[PDB]
């Protein structure tokens, strides 16, 4: 399913970057998982992950790197601390299951 994220974002001088990752759902899912992967040299590592029941605030597993806020079908992420950062959205319930993969975000550090 179509996931939209910016092509490029700028990171502040304190190493924190913020971008919006929005997603549409063919149905209306009440149980969503949002993941952020880092892709460099074909291999991918997990930046962070959060589980989302719509309207109940975005709960992140481990807030060491990512803190984010929900507002409908948009998620405003914040990552702290030079590859490609991909926003992943999983519509778990109700069926059907949907996987969404954004086109990736480049992060330039001024």
């Amino acid at each position, epitope marked *: 399913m179509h996931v939209a994220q910016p092509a490029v974002v700028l990171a502040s001088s304190r190493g924190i970057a913020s971008f919006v990752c929005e997603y549409a759902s063919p149905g209306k899912a009440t*149980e969503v998982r949002v993941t952020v992967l880092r892709q460099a040299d074909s291999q991918v590592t*997990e930046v962070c992950a959060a589980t989302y029941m719509m309207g109940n605030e975005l709960t992140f597993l481990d807030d060491s790197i990512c803190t984010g806020t929900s507002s409908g079908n948009q998620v405003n992420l914040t990552i702290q601390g030079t590859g490609l950062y*991909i926003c*992943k959205v999983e519509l*778990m319930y109700p*069926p*059907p*299951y949907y*996987l969404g*993969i954004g086109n990736g975000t480049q992060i330039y550090v001024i």
Partner: antibody
Amino acid sequence: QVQLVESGGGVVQPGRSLRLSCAASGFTFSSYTMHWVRQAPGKGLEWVTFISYDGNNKYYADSVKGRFTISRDNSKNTLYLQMNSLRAEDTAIYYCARTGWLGPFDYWGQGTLVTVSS
Amino acid sequence: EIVLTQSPGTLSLSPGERATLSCRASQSVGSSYLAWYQQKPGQAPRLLIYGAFSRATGIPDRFSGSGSGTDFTLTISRLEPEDFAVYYCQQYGSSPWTFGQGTKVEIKR
């Protein structure tokens, strides 16, 4: 090195039950969704069932809906497949499969054979 | 249900030749949700291509993929003896996860 080893296959009569296991090693088990995929002899691949990271959500193919139950034990790095009310149409190789973080089934077990016949 | 469709049923080529395997989807599926698998007789499937174009780890460069929407392609630029096997495409963007019928690549003689 990612490893999937399934067990519990065997020969069984229609209506009976069989329990399969898939032992995973070489990766953080709870960080990946899992599938069972089956392959009848001489035919193609058919997806059977899917399970979430912790197990909150499970989905099944229509041919097994109501008779198969997928489960996992992240504490023991094991995946399960309780298959009841077996039919001859369930005769196949049952593969244990991991879902990659970008979608595909990136790792497969070597498979365990089940034969349902009267 | 997204029905996948492969062609041909059997490819008859010689070692060193170029193989082109087709996969068709009954409705449009994004490139990020298509994969190709190789299976040799008596062995479990093995991932080659994911995201239509990207190549799995440990897969030689002679394997590549292309296409979007309805029609997808797997290309083997130069067939090696170990490349003669069965190949399956799959969509993994939504449930149920569906596979194609498979395509057999045999040695022509």
